Design a protein around this nucleic acid. Sequence first.
DNA 1: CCGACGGCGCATCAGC
DNA 2: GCTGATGCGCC
DNA 3: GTCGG
Length: 326
Amino acid sequence: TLNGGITDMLTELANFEKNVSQAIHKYNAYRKAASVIAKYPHKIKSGAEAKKLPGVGTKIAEKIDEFLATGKLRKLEKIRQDDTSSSINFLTRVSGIGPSAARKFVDEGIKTLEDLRKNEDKLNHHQRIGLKYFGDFEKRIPREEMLQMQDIVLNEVKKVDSEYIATVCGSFRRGAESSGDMDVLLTHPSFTSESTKQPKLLHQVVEQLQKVHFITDTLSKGETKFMGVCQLPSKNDEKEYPHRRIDIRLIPKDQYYCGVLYFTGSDIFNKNMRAHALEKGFTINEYTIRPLGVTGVAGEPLPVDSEKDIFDYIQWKYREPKDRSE
DNA sequence: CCGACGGCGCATCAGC
DNA sequence: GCTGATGCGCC
DNA sequence: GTCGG
Ligand SMILES: [Mg+2]
Ligand SMILES: [Mg+2]
Ligand code: NA
Ligand code: NA
Ligand code: NA
């Protein structure tokens, strides 16, 4: 990556603002700048040069000049030495522990992996599982393993009901060589925006995957979204594969394109595209794209028959999944 | 200057 | 119990 | 922190 030092700096700042400062808009600002810089095809020579890019402002330009000149950022150097900031940042690496719980734990004297392990009864279910698999959840998933996981999920889903369609989204669908977790969009013709003609549609699928020992734990689960843990089977004498995060989202079948647009991401691409939609007088979620009335109230869902239809409404040329890794 | 910044599912909790 | 606010998660 | 009105 041409500007890796700068993008790392901005990502670290973003994480600080999110985890410690609890300043969600500064977090988003920093990530937006990191992302636009990441795709810039030149090795940046100055803050001024960077400031030409949408999302990079005066303050980031100044940090960029400091970083280019010295290879570091004093602001970050100090943050890295601050024990409370260090502690809070670490604790938030556990799935289920956010900025608030992290600060609360540090208040109570719980601030290391050892502290967490001996205070399991101070954790909710989600946090308990995040702790259990702390190491595993920070590992990436090789695309080769994602393919094996895809094969199991698609085949087991088929065994439940041949009418289900499961689609692997997230970075996998963007063609990444490695993924952070597995994202599965699920549809069934019994569940549309007009009616739910069959209950337990998501449950049946979760059950089957648990039955074949693919899903190993559950972080949360409702009628349309499952958030849990899974694991590839290993062969005789073979070391086990790491446990992996899996998210499954059941989406009304007639709203598949908005759903797959959403679940394909990236997250920054979605924020950027949805913000552009608003500027264009539309609102996009995982279900529909709707016009904004003169008052700002969302109108009725617009007809959508492809991902491209959505791009057309907001006057964007189509971008294939592989070009949405912002 | 200053309001807006994407949108929503599930878990947990307060107030009634 | 329900409703609404908040935390945390997903892209 | 950055942007647009
Ligand atoms: Mg993912
Ligand atoms: Mg992600
Ligand atoms: Na700029
Ligand atoms: Na966390
Ligand atoms: Na995911």
